[PDB]
Amino acid sequence: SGFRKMAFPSGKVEGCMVQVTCGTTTLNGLWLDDVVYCPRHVICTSEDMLNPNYEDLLIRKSNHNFLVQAGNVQLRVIGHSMQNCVLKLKVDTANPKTPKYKFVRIQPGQTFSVLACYNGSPSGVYQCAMRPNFTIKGSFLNGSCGSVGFNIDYDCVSFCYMHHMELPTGVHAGTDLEGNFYGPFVDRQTAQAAGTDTTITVNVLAWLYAAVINGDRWFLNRFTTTLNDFNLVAMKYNYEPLTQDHVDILGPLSAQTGIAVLDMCASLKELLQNGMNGRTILGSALLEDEFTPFDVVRQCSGVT
């Protein structure tokens, strides 16, 4: 028992982190096979932050201007290209530590682990969710760009995020590994609206199921509700509308606990309307939405 915001083991990703420098700018890159992937804003200067012409900036750069270091050893760059907001630096050596991998564009509400890095060196690992508004609530400082988010399925690393920027509001934005930003964000030092962030209802319910499995049952009530009645409450509290697809995804947790999904919805409706009354659930005083139903089953089953 016990429920923690667990991240995937980061070893397979640590073995891919390299440092990329262009001019005076240093950030992190991801070395997979003979390619190093990094945010294209590595080619920017102080005067090229508010409105960069990446195509024009990149034209002034040659292979030897991109310094890539893996640990203490220098990688030789034999090609460079821009794919959306990422640069792909072809190096003469395939990463010997390259794990089995995939590039995936995750759905909002899905979770992933982030390996925060500085100067190509890993500093820490944490679990987070892609918010419905396509931002992440990470922990990133200057130099963390190019740090990646990923999921692990047995031996395969699915890379889903590359860190590009911090919005003036302290939230984070970035791209998939094809360089396409999640959300409406652009790699420019301008004010950008993140948008209203809703609560991932299916994740809150999954966490309530985790709470029941882990002994926390005070919030369970004698009520039930309907999807339409529940959603009237969810709308009022800026919660994502729950659909039959979400109910179906909660099926295994509903079967394990013996609590019907609409019954758990009535517990959630009462918690929203009444608050926690100074009480806690899984060591938390607010409703947690950064655990998917898959994360709950995984943590409560011991998938390695």
Next chain:
Amino acid sequence: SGFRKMAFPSGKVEGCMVQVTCGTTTLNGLWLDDVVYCPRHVICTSEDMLNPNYEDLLIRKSNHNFLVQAGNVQLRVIGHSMQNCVLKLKVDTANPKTPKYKFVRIQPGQTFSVLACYNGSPSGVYQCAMRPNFTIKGSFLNGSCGSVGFNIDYDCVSFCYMHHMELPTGVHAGTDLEGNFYGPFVDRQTAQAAGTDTTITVNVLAWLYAAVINGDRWFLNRFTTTLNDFNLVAMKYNYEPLTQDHVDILGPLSAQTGIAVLDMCASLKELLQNGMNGRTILGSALLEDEFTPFDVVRQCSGVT
């Protein structure tokens, strides 16, 4: 900016995880140099859980009864011995992935990362604190024994915890890497009192400093207090008494924010007496105590 419960990158520890089986019992071991460390209760059966005589049980075991597997390959056991509550299995091969390491017995209130493992395979990584009552609030299932807690200082892994058991209350207990339990716990399937768990005051203050650094300042007030006045409040709320050593440790955070430690104490006193009033601090609705002042400086400075 952003503040997350960050764990150390786990790669160096993943490379040390092995599976140990004795009879019908399988758990995890830690392979460092030519020794595999594991909980001694691996030699127990169902009838040897309530009151095991480890010395007598171990006498019926020979080297070939300990099956150690590193990935898919079998390790040859050439020696075995019991040191307190851990077994040390000497194998004929030194772990080629052995990192620079230390065995340390951590102080209550200090934090560490746990790499939860099953069958010698890592499942996840999370950060936790050694509670003042010498328990940990982990996430562990059957088969997780032998999973370890550690800290990383540049390239050196300081192992501080080995998982041994779950108390009937859902909290976790275990040993340092010399096999000495943290707290009064014994490796027996009997009811064991954990003791009153207090809140790590110096950690709550460190987290309040992290909140200020990360923009959350609503809780800051126009008041100050004294160590003795603060401790009268801390006692009432089952908080550890704050000492000058704790004030001195908060010195760098006090200097970075320009907020005197006793001024932050008055903010903490008011939060304890008045509650959060439905507000949050660093995405939390309760006062967080599992970040040390060192963790706050590290996360807010980017130590790799």
